[PDB]
Structure formats: C-alpha cells, structure tokens
Amino acid sequence: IRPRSATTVTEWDYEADVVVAGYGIAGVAASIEAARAGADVLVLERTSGWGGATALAGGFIYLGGGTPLQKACGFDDSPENMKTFMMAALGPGADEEKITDYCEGSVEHYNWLVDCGVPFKESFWGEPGWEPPFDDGLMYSGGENAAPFNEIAAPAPRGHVPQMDGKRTGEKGGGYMLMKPLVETAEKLGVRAEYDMRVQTLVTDDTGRVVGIVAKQYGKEVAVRARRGVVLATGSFAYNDKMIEAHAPRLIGRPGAAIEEHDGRSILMAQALGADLAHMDATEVAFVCDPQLIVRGILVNGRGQRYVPEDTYSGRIGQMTLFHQDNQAFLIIDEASYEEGAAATTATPFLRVQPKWAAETVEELESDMGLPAGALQSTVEVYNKHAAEGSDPLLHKKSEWVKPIGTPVAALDLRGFTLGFTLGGLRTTVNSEVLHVSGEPIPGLFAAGRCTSGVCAGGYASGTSLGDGSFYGRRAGISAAKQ
Amino acid sequence: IRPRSATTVTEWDYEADVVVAGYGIAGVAASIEAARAGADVLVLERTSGWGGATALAGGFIYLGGGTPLQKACGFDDSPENMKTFMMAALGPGADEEKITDYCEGSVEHYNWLVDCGVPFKESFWGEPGWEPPFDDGLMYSGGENAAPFNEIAAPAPRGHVPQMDGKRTGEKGGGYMLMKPLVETAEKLGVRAEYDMRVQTLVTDDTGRVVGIVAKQYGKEVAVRARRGVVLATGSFAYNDKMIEAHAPRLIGRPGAAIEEHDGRSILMAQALGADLAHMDATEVAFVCDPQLIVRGILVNGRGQRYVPEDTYSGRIGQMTLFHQDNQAFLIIDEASYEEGAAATTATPFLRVQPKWAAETVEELESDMGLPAGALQSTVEVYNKHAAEGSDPLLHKKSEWVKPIGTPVAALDLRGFTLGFTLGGLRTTVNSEVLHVSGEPIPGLFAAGRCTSGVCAGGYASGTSLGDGSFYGRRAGISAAKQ
Ligand SMILES: Cc1cc2nc3c(=O)[nH]c(=O)nc-3n(C[C@H](O)[C@H](O)[C@H](O)COP(=O)(O)OP(=O)(O)OC[C@H]3O[C@@H](n4cnc5c(N)ncnc54)[C@H](O)[C@@H]3O)c2cc1C
Ligand SMILES: Cc1cc2nc3c(=O)[nH]c(=O)nc-3n(C[C@H](O)[C@H](O)[C@H](O)COP(=O)(O)OP(=O)(O)OC[C@H]3O[C@@H](n4cnc5c(N)ncnc54)[C@H](O)[C@@H]3O)c2cc1C
Ligand SMILES: [Cl-]
Ligand SMILES: [Cl-]
Numbered sequence: 001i002r003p004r005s006a007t008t009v010t011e012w013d014y015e016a017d018v019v020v021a022g023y024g025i026a027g028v029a030a031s032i033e034a035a036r037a038g039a040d041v042l043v044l045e046r047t048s049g050w051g052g053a054t055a056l057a058g059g060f061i062y063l064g065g066g067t068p069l070q071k072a073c074g075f076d077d078s079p080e081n082m083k084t085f086m087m088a089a090l091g092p093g094a095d096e097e098k099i100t101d102y103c104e105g106s107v108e109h110y111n112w113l114v115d116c117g118v119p120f121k122e123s124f125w126g127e128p129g130w131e132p133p134f135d136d137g138l139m140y141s142g143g144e145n146a147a148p149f150n151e152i153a154a155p156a157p158r159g160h161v162p163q164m165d166g167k168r169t170g171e172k173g174g175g176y177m178l179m180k181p182l183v184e185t186a187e188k189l190g191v192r193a194e195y196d197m198r199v200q201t202l203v204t205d206d207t208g209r210v211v212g213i214v215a216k217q218y219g220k221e222v223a224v225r226a227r228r229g230v231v232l233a234t235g236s237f238a239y240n241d242k243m244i245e246a247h248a249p250r251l252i253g254r255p256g257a258a259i260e261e262h263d264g265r266s267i268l269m270a271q272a273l274g275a276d277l278a279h280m281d282a283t284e285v286a287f288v289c290d291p292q293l294i295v296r297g298i299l300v301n302g303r304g305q306r307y308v309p310e311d312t313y314s315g316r317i318g319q320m321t322l323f324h325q326d327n328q329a330f331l332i333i334d335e336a337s338y339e340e341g342a343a344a345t346t347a348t349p350f351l352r353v354q355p356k357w358a359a360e361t362v363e364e365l366e367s368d369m370g371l372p373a374g375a376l377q378s379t380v381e382v383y384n385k386h387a388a389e390g391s392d393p394l395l396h397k398k399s400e401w402v403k404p405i406g407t408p409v410a411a412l413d414l415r416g417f418t419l420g421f422t423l424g425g426l427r428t429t430v431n432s433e434v435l436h437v438s439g440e441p442i443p444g445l446f447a448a449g450r451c452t453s454g455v456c457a458g459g460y461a462s463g464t465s466l467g468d469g470s471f472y473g474r475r476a477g478i479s480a481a482k483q
Numbered sequence: 484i485r486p487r488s489a490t491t492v493t494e495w496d497y498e499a500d501v502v503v504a505g506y507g508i509a510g511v512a513a514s515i516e517a518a519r520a521g522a523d524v525l526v527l528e529r530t531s532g533w534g535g536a537t538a539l540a541g542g543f544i545y546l547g548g549g550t551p552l553q554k555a556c557g558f559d560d561s562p563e564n565m566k567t568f569m570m571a572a573l574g575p576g577a578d579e580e581k582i583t584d585y586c587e588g589s590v591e592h593y594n595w596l597v598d599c600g601v602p603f604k605e606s607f608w609g610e611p612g613w614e615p616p617f618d619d620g621l622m623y624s625g626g627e628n629a630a631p632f633n634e635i636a637a638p639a640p641r642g643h644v645p646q647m648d649g650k651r652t653g654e655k656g657g658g659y660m661l662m663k664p665l666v667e668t669a670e671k672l673g674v675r676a677e678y679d680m681r682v683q684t685l686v687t688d689d690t691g692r693v694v695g696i697v698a699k700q701y702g703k704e705v706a707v708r709a710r711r712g713v714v715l716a717t718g719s720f721a722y723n724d725k726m727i728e729a730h731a732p733r734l735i736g737r738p739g740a741a742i743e744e745h746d747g748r749s750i751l752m753a754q755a756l757g758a759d760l761a762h763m764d765a766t767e768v769a770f771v772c773d774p775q776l777i778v779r780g781i782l783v784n785g786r787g788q789r790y791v792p793e794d795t796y797s798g799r800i801g802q803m804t805l806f807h808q809d810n811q812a813f814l815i816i817d818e819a820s821y822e823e824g825a826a827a828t829t830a831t832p833f834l835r836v837q838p839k840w841a842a843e844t845v846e847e848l849e850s851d852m853g854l855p856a857g858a859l860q861s862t863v864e865v866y867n868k869h870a871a872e873g874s875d876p877l878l879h880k881k882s883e884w885v886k887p888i889g890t891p892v893a894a895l896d897l898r899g900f901t902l903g904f905t906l907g908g909l910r911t912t913v914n915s916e917v918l919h920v921s922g923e924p925i926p927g928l929f930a931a932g933r934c935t936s937g938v939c940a941g942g943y944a945s946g947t948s949l950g951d952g953s954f955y956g957r958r959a960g961i962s963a964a965k966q
Contacts, residue, residue: 249576
C-alpha cells in the first residue's frame with residue numbers, strides 16, 4: 001500500500017494522460033470530461049465489465065433547483081431551497097461549500113446528463129415507495145415532504161430517475177440507464193478501458209506528485225503511467241470488515257453495498273500519501289419493509305414508543321431505527337390498514353412483511369409482544385386521541401396519513417431490518433482534488449464517488465450517491481486533464 | 484505538517500534516545516518506563532509546565548480484575564468480568580485485543596501506580612455523583628451497577644481515585660495526585676524536560692523511520708533527535724474546529740476538553756506518514772446536572788418519553804441524550820424528591836439545576852412545557868403503575884430508586900446540557916506502536932493517550948482516559964526504549 005517511487009518502475013505497461021481507477025458512475029463521468037478536454041484517457045476496471053454498483057442501483061440521481069423535469073411535473077425549486085434542505089438533512093457537519101456548489105450547478109448537471117443521452121420521463125410518482133413502480137422520472141427521495149424538513153425548506157421532489165422498462169434493482173436497475181448512455185458517450189470520445197485491473201498502489205515522483213499506479217491485471221503486476229492525473233473512482237469500503245469495525249461499526253454484520261469490490265483500497269492508497277478523510281462513520285441505512293405498509297401504521301421502538309413520522313423517507317426510518325432505537329422496531333397496524341397497504345402499488349412487493357402477532361385488542365397485542373402493561377396501550381391511546389382530529393403533534397406525520405388505529409390490530413416484527421453502505425472517505429475539494437492533511441491538494445491525485453466524502457456527512461437522501469459521483473466525477477476529469 | 488527529511492536537518496538543537504511529546508499522563512508514564520529501561524529521555528511540553536488535562540481531571544483511573552483497593556472495599560472482580568463489561572459498554576466495535584490486554588494487566592498496573600507513590604484511600608463512595616465528595620478511593624464510574632450492563636457482567640466498581648484533599652476539577656483535580664508522584668518518579672530517574680515546545684512535524688530518514696521532531700520553542704524553530712523513538716502524547720483534537728466538523732460533528736459548538744492545546748496536531752503529523760486512525764467519531768459526553776437530582780426523577784425526551792434508566796453513569800445519560808434524543812431532555816421530579824436530592828451529599832453542588840416549571844398536576848405541567856395532551860401524562864401514569872410495585876420494566880432503573888412520582892411536580896429544562904471531548908485517534912498496537920494503513924508499525928513512532936484510539940470505541944466510562952493513557956503510556960516507553 002506504500003507508494004512506489006517512479007524511479008523503481010523499469011517499464012510502463014500502459015500510459016495515458018488521465019488514468020481513471022473504477023468504471024462506475026464517478027469514473028465514466030470523469031472519463032467524458034477528460035476526453036472532451038483533449039486528454040488521452042484510460043479507465044482501469046477491476047471486474048470484467050463496466051457499471052459497478054451504479055448499474056445495479058434504483059437509478060435515483062439527486063437533482064433540483066428547477067430542472068426541466070421538476071418544471072414539467074409542476075414543482076417549484078431553487079438552488080437556495082435545495083441547499084437549505086440538504087444542509088439540514090445530510091448533516092450534522094455537512095460540507096457547506098460542497099453542498100452550495102452542488103446545488104448551484106444542479107440544473108446544468110441535469111441538462112448535461114440529458115445531453116449525454118440519459119432519458120427521463122416527464123412524470124412524477126407520488127406514493128410511498130423505494131422507487132417508481134413504473135418508468136416515471138421524478139419522485140420524493142429524501143423526506144423533503146415530511147417532518148422535520150417540510151418546515152425547514154419548501155418541499156420539492158429531487159429524485160430524478162432515468163427512464164427504463166423492467167428495472168431490477170440489484171441485477172440491472174434504473175442505474176443501468178444512467179451508466180449506458182454515459183459509456184456510449186465515453187466510447188465515442190475515444191476513452192480506452194482495461195479490464196481485470198485491480199489497482200493496488202500509487203506511484204509518486206521525488207516531489208510527491210502522483211504520476212501513475214501499480215495494479216494486478218490477468219494475474220501479474222503492471223504499472224500504468226498518468227502524465228496529467230490519476231482519478232480514484234473505485235467505490236466505498238462497505239466490504240472491508242476491518243475498516244467497518246474501525247470506522248463505521250454500526251454496520252458490523254449488516255453490510256448492504258451492491259458489490260464486493262467496495263473494499264476501501266483507494267482510500268488506503270491515498271492515506272499512505274497523507275490524504276485526509278472525513279465522516280468515516282457516516283452510513284446509508286435501508287429499512288427492508290414496504291413503505292406502503294409503514295405509512296399506514298405506527299412504528300414503535302422496543303419500549304412501545306413512537307419515534308419517527310411514518311411518512312418520511314424509508315432510509316431515514318432506517319437510520320433512526322439503527323442509530324437511535326438499538327435496531328428494534330415494530331409496525332403496529334390495524335387489519336383494514338394492513339390490507340389496504342398490502343394492495344397498494346409498489347416497486348417492492350417482496351418487502352410486504354407479514355404480521356408476527358395479531359390480536360383483538362391493543363392490550364392483548366401488548367402482552368403478546370412482551371411489552372410492559374400500558375407501554376403500548378398508552379402510545380396508542382395518545383396517538384388515537386389526536387388522530388381523531390387528524391393531528392400528529394408528537395412526530396408530525398402528515399394529516400392525510402393520520403387516523404385512529406382500530407381493531408383487530410397486528411404487529412410486524414421489524415427488529416434487525418436494517419443494512420447499509422458507507423458514506424465516508426477521502427476529503428476532496430469542489431474540483432475533486434484529494435486533500436492532504438496539510439490542507440493542500442496532493443499533486444496529480446483526484447477522486448470522486450464513494451471513495452470520497454461527498455454531499456452526505458451523516459443523513460442520507462436517495463440519489464445523492466449517483467448525484468455526487470456523477471457531478472464530482474465530471475470535476476475530477478476536468479481537473480485531471482489540466483496541464 | 485509534511486515530514487522533514489533528516490538530510491535537511493543541518494543541526495540538532497537537542498538529542499535523546501526517547502523523545503516524548505506532551506507531559507501529561509501518557510507522556511509521564513512513557514518517560515518512567517523508558518528511563519527505567521536505561522534510555523536517555525527528553526519530554527517536550529508545549530506549555531510552561533507539566534500536567535496537561537490530567538492535572539485538572541477528577542482523577543478517576545479505570546482499573547479492576549481484583550485490585551487491592553477493590554478487595555479492601557469488599558468487591559469481587561476478575562479480568563474476564565471486567566472485559567465482558569468493557570466490550571459491552573465501550574463499543575460498538577471495541578478493540579477486543581486491546582481491552583483484553585488492558586484487563587489482564589489491570590491489577591499489575593494498579594500496583595505499579597502505588598509503587599510510584601500514587602496514594603489511594605481504602606474506602607468506597609456509594610452515592611450517585613460525578614466524583615467522591617471526600618477523599619474516597621473507589622466508586623462506580625461506568626454504569627456497571629445499572630441496566631443494561633448489570634445483567635451482562637457482574638457489577639464491580641472500577642473508578643479508582645487518588646487520595647487528595649481540596650480537589651477542584653478544572654483547576655487542580657484528583658488527577659493532580661496521579662500526575663505529581665509520577666513526575667517525582669520521572670525526575671528521580673533523570674528524565675529531562677523542555678518547555679514552550681510546540682511540536683510541529685516528524686523527521687524521517689530515507690527508510691521512513693521517525694528519527695526526530697521539529698518544534699517551535701521560545702519563538703524559533705528547533706530540531707530534536709530521537710535515536711530510539713518518538714512517543715506522541717499530546718492529547719485530543721477537541722479544540723480543532725475543522726477536525727470536529729469533519730470527524731466528530733456531534734460536538735460542534737459543545738467543546739468540553741479541559742485544555743486548548745488539544746488541537747490534534749500529533750494525529751495530523753502521523754497521518755502525514757500514512758498512519759491509520761480509528762473511531763474518529765467517538766465522543767465522551769458529560770451531562771451538567773447533579774446526579775443526586777437525576778436519580779430521584781424521570782428523564783424524558785422532547786416527546787415526553789423516558790429513554791434511559793436514571794441511575795446509570797451520568798456520562799451515559801449524556802451520550803443517550805445528545806446522540807439519540809436530539810439533545811433534548813427534561814427531568815420530571817416531585818417536590819419532595821427534588822428537596823431530598825438537593826440536600827444529598829455531592830461533589831458538584833453547583834450542578835443543582837433549579838426547576839423551570841412547577842405545577843400542582845402532571846396535566847398542568849405537561850401543558851406548561853408545551854407537550855401534546857397526554858404525552859407526559861401517559862408516561863407518568865405507566866411509570867407510576869409499575870413503580871407502585873417497585874418495578875421499572877421499561878428501562879430497569881434499580882428498585883431502590885423506583886417509586887411513584889407524586890405532586891406537586893416540577894420539570895428541569897435540560898435541553899442543551901451536554902458537552903464533550905474526543906475519543907478517536909491514531910491506531911496503535913498493544914505495544915503502543917503507531918500503525919500505518921498497511922497494518923505495519925511505523926518504525927520509530929509510538930503513541931498513547933488521547934492522541935490515540937484507546938479502550939473506548941464509542942461508549943465511555945469515567946477513568947478510562949487516565950487508565951488507558953497511563954497503561955499504554957508505559958507500553959510506549961518500553962517499546963520506544965528498545966534498540
Ligand atoms: C440496493 C441499492 C440501491 C441503490 N440505489 C441507489 C440510487 O438509486 N441512487 C443513489 O444515489 N445511490 C444508490 N445506491 C448507491 C450507489 O449504487 C453507489 O453508492 C454508487 O453506485 C457508487 O458509485 P461509485 O462510482 O463510487 O462506485 P461504482 O459504481 O461501484 O464503481 C466503482 C468501480 O470501481 C471498481 N473497483 C473497485 N476496486 C477497484 C480497484 N482496486 N481497481 C480498479 N477498479 C476497482 C468496481 O468494480 C466498480 O466497477 C444504491 C445502493 C444499493 C445497495
Ligand atoms: C471535566 C473533566 C474531567 C475529567 N476527569 C477525568 C477522569 O476523572 N478520569 C479520566 O480518565 N479522564 C478524565 N477526563 C479526561 C482526561 O482529563 C483526559 O482525557 C486525559 O488527561 C488526556 O491525557 P493525555 O496524556 O492524552 O493528555 P494531557 O494530560 O492533556 O497531556 C497532553 C500534553 O501535551 C501537550 N501538548 C499539546 N500539544 C503539544 C505539542 N504540539 N507539542 C508538545 N506538547 C503538546 C499539552 O500541553 C499537555 O501537557 C476529564 C475531562 C474533563 C473535561
Ligand atoms: Cl452500493
Ligand atoms: Cl480533557
């Protein structure tokens with residue numbers, strides 16, 4: 001992992017101006033910009049083909065500030081409103097400079113993606129869910145339309161989703177129709193790609209400039225020269241158990257990144273040169289229960305207490321459950337509401353969890369679940385008293401979802417229903433330069449995507465990973481192509 | 484911050500075998516061991532005198548496994564029981580190798596401290612509090628005698644406190660009687676000290692070995708040669724705002740380390756060489772309300788819900804409040820119980836917070852506090868139903884503290900009552916060698932105390948900082964003195 005001195009490289013197996021490690025969203029975006037700038041670009045991919053986790057993703061891309069898609073669907077937004085939301089939802093300690101930059105450039109970035117051939121349907125999906133069941137292009141994806149954020153920033157949906165039939169998240173998701181037009185663009189520009197390239201070490205000259213990389217390809221060591229810059233774009237550290245334990249131990253035993261190649265190597269390679277890190281504890285957290293069920297009940301913790309409005313983003317429900325309720329949750333839902341939720345339109349019918357307990361009364365359900373007498377009954381009594389008036393003054397679930405819980409009543413056992421991926425990584429500038437602990441860029445070294453600390457510092461919104469990876473991937477390619 | 488090449492050092496201002504940066508607990512312990520091993524030892528201290536944060540501390544030192552002090556006070560313990568507790572309480576992701584080592588060596592370490600002249604009174608203080616009001620030597624300090632840990636490990640008090648009259652935490656605390664006998668020991672051994680030394684940069688040779696440091700002393704740059712090793716012992720990063728934002732943003736605006744010199748420089752200096760880090764998000768959190776009040780009431784969050792047994796360690800109450808209840812807490816307490824708590828013996832009478840609201844009934848108190856109708860009433864009704872039977876089945880506060888809340892009733896406003904210090908830092912071995920991201924020690928470089936990730940990975944127990952700093956300080960001195 002220690003850097004290799006360039007003087008010890010006897011021959012270069014490959015050479016380019018800009019060498020991009022990783023052919024996912026950040027890597028392809030960097031390749032396009034670098035090639036447009038006139039650089040000779042070579043992408044190094046560890047597997048046998050392009051796409052990475054991006055091709056398996058739902059395809060949300062977190063964009064706003066008044067995109068053509070938001071306008072076509074009748075939703076106002078601005079860069080200031082988007083920034084207000086993201087600072088509140090994606091912290092604490094969110095990078096104000098980076099978020100401001102991302103928001104100010106968002107509409108241009110949407111148009112840039114469309115120019116590369118990424119298609120979006122001018123239609124909005126408005127029901128709770130993890131993704132649009134159909135090929136709709138816009139959806140709420142960060143809890144913008146739920147408490148507390150709906151009182152902090154004006155709600156606007158920012159989940160932009162490429163148009164695709166037969167989306168299968170985890171196999172070939174909406175994220176595939178982000179990657180494919182970008183790959184076609186890169187290929188037409190003359191971007192080169194080498195496969196089975198497992199990048200291992202950075203090569204530096206006696207000034208400390210990064211001037212190439214060492215990799216294993218087809219079983220043997222190879223050295224790749226980078227005349228202008230190396231862009232690290234190899235993904236997260238979710239599958240590196242030692243790093244999870246040391247940095248993000250809330251994910252011990254509940255890994256949820258899309259691919260195994262997310263082993264943190266590029267973070268380590270850069271740390272070896274003195275690169276700085278940020279938010280290494282930050283984690284996306286999914287909650288594997290269908291949102292159409294969740295929104296029609298109340299979530300309670302292991303003490304029978306409500307703790308999150310049930311109409312926020314499911315990922316935020318995941319974080320609140322794992323982080324603050326010791327990963328213990330139950331959905332309390334009356335039989336009629338469960339039936340309505342189970343019949344509702346969803347992209348994830350496989351997440352329709354069946355109730356574990358069912359009873360004629362809340363008092364019986366409470367004793368069935370092993371809760372102390374009154375713990376659940378009181379929660380339901382107080383909820384119902386205010387719900388009869390359409391009001392949730394405790395957690396501010398929107399009134400359209402608020403009504404008394406009736407009988408018979410059921411409980412879904414949602415203990416240990418979370419998993420996630422890492423959000424921390426290398427510290428980078430808005431130009432995607434990797435920062436040394438001195439606060440200065442490391443010459444020749446750029447990075448984007450989930451090997452970096454991006455727009456999310458703590459909280460997460462769906463789309464921010466493909467959003468920041470593509471946005472800052474572009475910046476890394478622009479910067480790396482400079483002479 | 485980038486390392487200085489030794490070839491560029493034209494003259495060394497000072498030279499020693501073992502150079503210790505920082506004259507607090509970790510630094511003095513390292514100095515004693517290195518000098519006992521026959522090394523020429525030089526301590527570099529940034530301020531005008533020794534002691535650092537240690538001299539201002541309450542003086543708890545987290546020790547167990549059957550110390551002479553535990554035995555004299557009639558408390559059984561073993562290294563296995565101590566390990567079981569610490570793994571459960573100081574995680575998640577606690578370092579099992581390090582905790583096991585610390586527990587197996589704890590009794591020897593207690594005896595080592597006594598041999599150096601640290602005095603302890605053979606007496607135990609049993610009432611809730613932040614420290615013994617008098618000169619008692621033993622106290623519970625980590626919630627060992629409260630849920631959930633009292634069902635996971637056999638309770639044993641491990642807060643060992645040096646004997647001292649007129650202890651004033653933040654000025655000259657019990658921690659002073661840890662530091663003073665150790666300084667006397669170090670002085671008799673011939674340990675040298677230079678003051679106004681602000682260490683800035685490590686010096687490396689062409690193999691990457693750390694062979695000295697560069698510092699500013701008395702206004703000018705100086706270079707200090709370390710023939711055998713450099714021990715970094717300069718404290719935490721709590722006062723470095725940029726590092727707090729990037730790594731531990733839960734502490735933004737609520738700093739609570741004892742001294743300003745905790746600016747993270749040694750963490751950065753070592754990262755520049757490729758040193759690895761762990762648990763950079765981990766934070767001790769104090770809760771600035773007297774424990775004799777807290778234990779006689781119920782704590783509720785901003786939704787009027789209980790969330791922590793009120794007889795656990797106050798620091799754990801702090802963490803639960805800041806981390807999981809958005810820093811919002813209120814103590815609900817009846818007038819009679821408040822009077823009894825306010826009259827109880829404490830080291831911290833200045834933390835006797837006065838109630839903000841007082842009412843004849845819980846229903847009135849609830850509406851006074853702005854809580855929704857029923858939110859607080861139901862909490863108190865359920866608590867009281869079980870408390871009439873001496874039982875807290877929700878949070879398992881011990882029965883001796885459980886009884887119905889009566890009337891009139893008051894609420895203390897404990898929103899924004901937390902502050903803390905950082906627990907993350909350099910990754911070190913059990914021999915206090917600083918680890919590179921490669922997993923190999925950096926030659927010549929050792930570290931201990933709050934510039935390192937020690938026994939705490941997340942949770943905190945009082946005494947673990949002076950405990951691990953002194954224990955791993957010894958190891959750093961032993962390792963650094965080797966040829
Ligand atoms: C179920 C699920 C759904 C998701 N849906 C969304 C979504 O809708 N919107 C969103 O924003 N995020 C989503 N994500 C997250 C998103 O998929 C990833 O965070 C994102 O794709 C990472 O982009 P990247 O360019 O950093 O990594 P990738 O797209 O994974 O690309 C990294 C590439 O680097 C290669 N690589 C790894 N190591 C090396 C090496 N040593 N040498 C050379 N190459 C290497 C990999 O094989 C890979 O091709 C989802 C995640 C999950 C688990
Ligand atoms: C109110 C309060 C009470 C506490 N009580 C306890 C307790 O009872 N038990 C417990 O375990 N913990 C307690 N702590 C924590 C404990 O005080 C510290 O964590 C511990 O003293 C740190 O030990 P150290 O050796 O790392 O740092 P220190 O003891 O602070 O020593 C570090 C030394 O390095 C010097 N230094 C800094 N930078 C440089 C530099 N660049 N060059 C040279 N020198 C430098 C400093 O001036 C200082 O003298 C308490 C904290 C607070 C805030
Ligand atoms: Cl992923
Ligand atoms: Cl401190």
